[PDB]
């Protein structure tokens, strides 16, 4: 049974764009370690060894990309198989990878943070008008309650019926019967998000994000050492290595399409003082451009990773707000 | 709040004997990988790199041993901090480690596989006579039901009262009220084991073993590579590295006290044709000696680990039974 790519993408976030299979990429060991530190709640220790043969940006070809979701937690991540390429001799032509499909977000969707009344025993889930009119089939507004049943599929192949009703003073679109069963069964709370989409097959699907336990196989350090050693050993032998990317836990993508890297680096010219826009995901899974200024250009970590493009742009924001946005970003993160 | 060492040891198994803090040990990277393969359901890949500086038996000093248990699963394991020592200069004297306590099993205990009637809504838990008389306070056998309430502590600091009753035709010691609450709350099934002990403080405690989900942080390979790289990097720098040992999942101890290694190796003399006894844990957490014959003495893995003492004795058993016992063992596993 095959995992729904679009719902996976809706859940992943609007800015998530995965490398295509068969494509060249740059793999940034520092970005990898960052994702591991999040998962490990502890940062990459000072001791992790030197790998002289492992560059800060390792050109690979994508052997495979697969999409995963956990049925109890709703954790999602992609597994990518990357082979480092040192010359054209290391590069499988793209046809050798068979037919590929795009990694696309659904164009019809909505996403909402759950309120307290979305999760209360009575009250139901309130749907915004435009979302109900775009995503649900049209109601018979002459019915004494206008109402219908929606059959919705989740990312784990389970089906759920929700009663969709239009009532109240003022009238509101609500999901009632079956909604509280979903909330109960999945242990959703206020603060979590729920998303509805139509996929390419016009299937009505539903996805979940959860707001805000250590491994007892390997120490945090060994996991951090293993990240580095697997890449260094793959580089030496030109063998495939498998990375995981969790787009809800990962602070920044660390597998960067060559085309994206080139547009940002090779052609461009960046300076301290420069103005720039960076896209951020918004609460309803939209995108919003935030402006700032480059205030420095320098190595994130001059000792371990000299000259690394990873997070080498020190930036300040026009609207810092709660000091939400990162103080360092990478050249491929900005537009101008 | 401090984890009960004896109950931890009762749960761990009768043959489990951990290295003392401050002590010298040999660390067997191959044994480590074996434990990781169990946890990973996939074995150490062919590709894991050569580490010329990492010997098959790495002398370390034990910096620390701590005991852990998971409250939902009842998984238990120990974390050991090991520093490789290359000369006497690398060795902290033992007093520098402060007061140490022994790692001892409780002398008063019992363990039972749960039956179907141990887990049925009625029926209760049947306790063997000798176990009830040794572990529970004496009953008033003149009472119309002889009965008492036992206050029992689990490994996670939770308290449980069980009603202990003596009734039936024939009379049986049973745990009734509160037992089914325990079974329900902990999701125990027939096949799982339950253990009761008195600790050093004469506290009545209860432990659980369960009969018969992959990491999405790091690939199986990287975890296997990390095991090797952490040890090799600790060896080069003489720095501490932290290993986990799960005694219910680990096929053989891979951190071997120097004293145990020496008795088995340095003094001894082993031959093909030789008879030997090896201890195995029994169902009621007793120990049973099994006899066999050494049928070969040779490297487990001559290519990657030449001359390694790890699982270098090929053995046949007097009673193979279901082909339960390992076909290779290590010199420190046998007596003669
Ligand atoms: Cl490095
Ligand atoms: Cl380039
Ligand atoms: Cl090796
Ligand atoms: Cl020795």
UniProtKB/Swiss-Prot annotation, chains A, B:
Q: Name one GO biological process term.
A: auxin-activated signaling pathway
Q: What is its subcellular localisation?
A: Nucleus
Summarize tissue expression: Expressed in the whole plant with a lower expression in leaves. Detected in embryo axis, provascular tissues, procambium and some differentiated vascular regions of mature organs.
Q: Which residues form a coiled coil?
A: none
Q: What is known of its domains?
A: Interactions between auxin response factors (ARFs) and Aux/IAA proteins occur through their C-terminal dimerization domains III and IV.
Give the family per the record: Belongs to the ARF family.
Q: Does the keyword DNA-binding apply?
A: yes
Q: What are the entry keywords?
A: Activator, Auxin signaling pathway, Developmental protein, DNA-binding, Nucleus, Transcription, Transcription regulation
From the UniProt annotation, which stretches of this protein bind DNA?
110-212
Species for this entry: Arabidopsis thaliana (Mouse-ear cress)
Signal peptide range = none
This protein is called Auxin response factor 5
Tell me, what is one Gene Ontology molecular-function annotation carried by this entry?
transcription cis-regulatory region binding
Protein task: Auxin response factors (ARFs) are transcriptional factors that bind specifically to the DNA sequence 5'-TGTCTC-3' found in the auxin-responsive promoter elements (AuxREs). Seems to act as transcriptional activator. Formation of heterodimers with Aux/IAA proteins may alter their ability to modulate early auxin response genes expression. Mediates embryo axis formation and vascular tissues differentiation. Functionally redundant with ARF7. May be necessary to counteract AMP1 activity.
Q: Does the keyword Transcription apply?
A: yes
Full-protein positions shown: 49 to 389 of 902
Q: Chief localization class?
A: nucleus
The subunit structure is: Homodimers and heterodimers. Interacts with BRX and the auxin-responsive proteins IAA1, IAA12 (BODENLOS), IAA17 and ARF7.
């Amino acid at each position: 049974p095959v995992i729904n790519s679009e719902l996976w993408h809706a859940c992943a976030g609007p800015l998530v764009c995965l490398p295509q299979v068969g494509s060249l990429v740059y793999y940034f060991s520092q970005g990898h370690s960052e994702q591991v530190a999040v998962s490990t709640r502890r940062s990459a220790t000072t001791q992790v060894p030197n790998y002289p043969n492992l560059p800060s940006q390792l050109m690979c070809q994508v052997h495979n990309v697969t999409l995963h979701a956990d049925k109890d937690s709703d954790e999602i991540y992609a597994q990518m198989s990357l082979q480092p390429v040192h010359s054209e001799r290391d590069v499988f032509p793209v046809p050798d990878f068979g037919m590929l499909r795009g990694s696309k977000h659904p164009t019809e969707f909505f996403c909402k943070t759950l309120t307290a009344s979305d999760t209360s025993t009575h009250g139901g889930f309130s749907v915004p008008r435009r979302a109900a009119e775009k995503l649900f089939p049209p109601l018979d507004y002459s019915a004494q309650p206008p109402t219908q049943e929606l059959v919705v599929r989740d990312l784990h192949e389970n089906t759920w019926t929700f009663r969709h009703i239009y009532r109240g003073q003022p009238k509101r679109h609500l999901l009632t019967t079956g909604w509280s069963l979903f909330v109960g069964s999945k242990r959703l709370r206020a603060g979590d998000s729920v998303l509805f989409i139509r996929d390419e097959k016009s299937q009505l699907m539903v996805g979940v994000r959860r707001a805000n336990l250590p491994s007892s196989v390997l120490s945090a350090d060994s996991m951090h050492i293993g990240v580095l050693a697997a890449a260094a050993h793959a580089t030496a032998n030109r063998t495939p290595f498998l990375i995981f990317y969790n787009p809800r836990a990962c602070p920044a993508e660390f597998v960067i399409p060559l085309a994206k890297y080139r547009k940002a680096i090779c052609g461009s010219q960046l300076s301290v003082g420069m103005r720039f826009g960076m896209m951020f995901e918004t609460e309803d899974s939209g995108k919003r451009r935030y402006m700032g200024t480059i205030v420095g250009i320098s190595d994130l970590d001059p000792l371990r990773w000299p000259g690394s493009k990873w997070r080498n742009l020190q930036v300040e924001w026009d609207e810092p707000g709660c000091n939400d946005k990162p103080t360092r970003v990478s050249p491929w993160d900005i537009e101008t």
